Ligand SMILES: Nc1ncnc2c1ncn2[C@@H]1O[C@H](COP(=O)(O)OP(=O)(O)O)[C@@H](O)[C@H]1O
């Protein structure tokens with residue numbers, strides 16, 4: 001198959017604290033200063049503390065969206081310790097309403113790009129629906145409906161795992177996509193301040209189904225793509241168990257992809273299950289690993305880099321999800 005794509009993004013430390021623990025050697029390479037012997041890692045890209053939101057999009061998402069348009073499933077998720085910048089990365093800063101639009105993250109920029117590609121693709125027609133859900137403590141909540149209850153996971157023949165009874169909102173424009181996101185991202189923030197004891201333990205999954213029909217009478221070709229944009233629970237220890245499953249799954253896959261054989265429990269967590277195609281399955285996956293340089297993050301940084309390194313070993317098999325009728 002095709003190896004998944006791993007990127008490392010180093011967020012800048014808070015202003016006015018030296019002594020970094022991490023040095024970027026090149027656009028593919030970084031050195032972790034561990035003693036006595038330093039380690040170096042190689043990824044598809046390494047972005048330093050100055051990297052802009054837009055840069056991130058171009059390096060990571062642009063490709064995924066494109067292959068989405070061509071009918072492949074695709075997935076981007078952000079992994080890393082709490083406070084490493086996952087949310088800033090996929091979403092943007094909070095709290096900034098009347099300004100700093102250049103700060104919006106991957107997900108908003110993805111909407112923009114997707115819809116302009118579509119606009120330009122026009123015979124053929126397009127249909128997009130969004131879902132936004134949150135997994136907290138092995139438990140599902142619908143961000144589009146705060147009154148929803150009893151959400152649960154279910155397999156399909158099409159191979160899709162999905163959340164049964166989650167709102168699927170139809171959107172015809174970036175702008176419409178944007179309130180779906182806004183409304184949900186708020187519910188997420190709003191729930192995190194009582195409990196939902198922390199937002200640092202919840203995974204957030206924003207999904208767009210992208211379905212085109214090329215229809216030249218009588219015949220109709222149908223392409224359908226599932227795009228998952230995920231902001232994970234923080235990876236620090238104690239280690240949240242769904243993330244532990246994530247580690248276990250990544251590991252088993254590697255044993256398998258290169259030799260041996262192994263059992264991979266996708267069903268050990270709602271996350272690994274819902275993401276089953278994203279790992280080793282039918283989809284084009286990109287992982288952004290967020291790390292905070294700086295010396296007191298050394299341990300969690302080391303874990304993140306270790307995790308991401310294996311992840312880069314995994315291979316998916318992704319096909320155009322197609323169909324013909326009429
Ligand atoms: N690229 C960046 N540039 C500047 N500040 C950032 C960047 N990424 C994150 N931050 C800031 O660091 C803090 C944690 O980022 P956040 O996205 O909340 O972390 P996480 O989602 O990993 O818990 C926030 O204050 C955030 O605004």
Ligand SMILES: [Mg+2]
Pocket residue numbers: 083086087199200
């Ligand atoms: Mg966060």
